[PDB]
Amino acid sequence: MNIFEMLRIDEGLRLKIYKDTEGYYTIGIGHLLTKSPSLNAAKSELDKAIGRNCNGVITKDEAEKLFNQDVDAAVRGILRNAKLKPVYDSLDAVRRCALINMVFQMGETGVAGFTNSLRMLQQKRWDEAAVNLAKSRWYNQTPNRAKRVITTFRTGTWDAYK
Ligand SMILES: [Cl-]
Ligand SMILES: [Cl-]
């Protein structure tokens, strides 16, 4: 398993504009288009992102391209972030994937807000961090996905995804 297959399981793939769990306009493999209510604002962002008139629909290839950009940007963002970088550097390969997953879903800023959990992961207190991560809106809002990420941090294996 790798970051790509993990995220593909969590986000799914959709070739037409859709609303995410928060009601925002999205397309492909979890690529947020806009927090705006307007479907037109979404269609505009989409065409800007793809470089063609899409009319709310893209191809598999286009979806995978946005996905590659997004994963790269998530990684680069962690590496540039003063709060995230030290955590990432301290972790093993599997756990690294779990932090990238959180970042892709909630943004660098959002994850950087999990101060206590971050400190516990850095210290390698697996069980404690798992319990702390579950005390969040994130967990209450998307519990199945959260549980999968959480187990990954707890165990350092891919069992939740197998
Ligand atoms: Cl809570
Ligand atoms: Cl969920």
The closest alpha carbon to 80, from 49, 112, 102, 105, belongs to 112
Consult the annotation and say whether 136 binds a ligand: no
Q: Is 25 exposed, middle or buried (0-12, 13-18, 19+ CB in 10 A)?
A: buried
What is the four-CA torsion angle of 133, 137, 142, 144, rounded to 10 degrees? Answer: 30
Q: Which ligand is nearest to the CA of 10?
A: 2
22 Cα to the center of ligand 2, angstroms = 12
Taking the centre of ligand 1 as the mean of its atom positions, its distance from the CA of residue 133, in whole angstroms, is 9
- For residue 4, count other CB atoms closer than 10 A to its CB: 14
Give catalytic residue positions.
Answer: 11, 20
Report the C-alpha gap between 11 and 75 in whole angstroms: 17
3-class SS letters over the chain: CCHHHHHHHHHCCEEEEEECCCCCEEEECCEEEECCCCHHHHHHHHHHHHCCCCCCECCHHHHHHHHHHHHHHHHHHHHHCCCCHHHHHHCCHHHHHHHHHHHHHHHHHHHHCCHHHHHHHHCCCHHHHHHHHCCCHHHHHCHHHHHHHHHHHHHCCCHHHC
Experimental technique, in short, is X-ray
Supply the range of the domain harboring residue 118: 1-162
Greatest C-alpha distance within the chain: 50
The CA 52 to ligand 2 mean position distance, Å, reads: 32
Q: Domain tally for the chain?
A: 1
Would you say 90 is a known binding-site residue? no
Cα separation, 92 vs 98, whole angstroms: 10
Q: What is the resolution of this structure in A?
A: 1.7
Distances (CA, A) of 139 to 46, 90, 132, 144: 29, 24, 10, 8
Q: State the CATH number of the domain containing residue 97.
A: 1.10.530.40
**49 CA from centroid of ligand 1 (Å):** 36
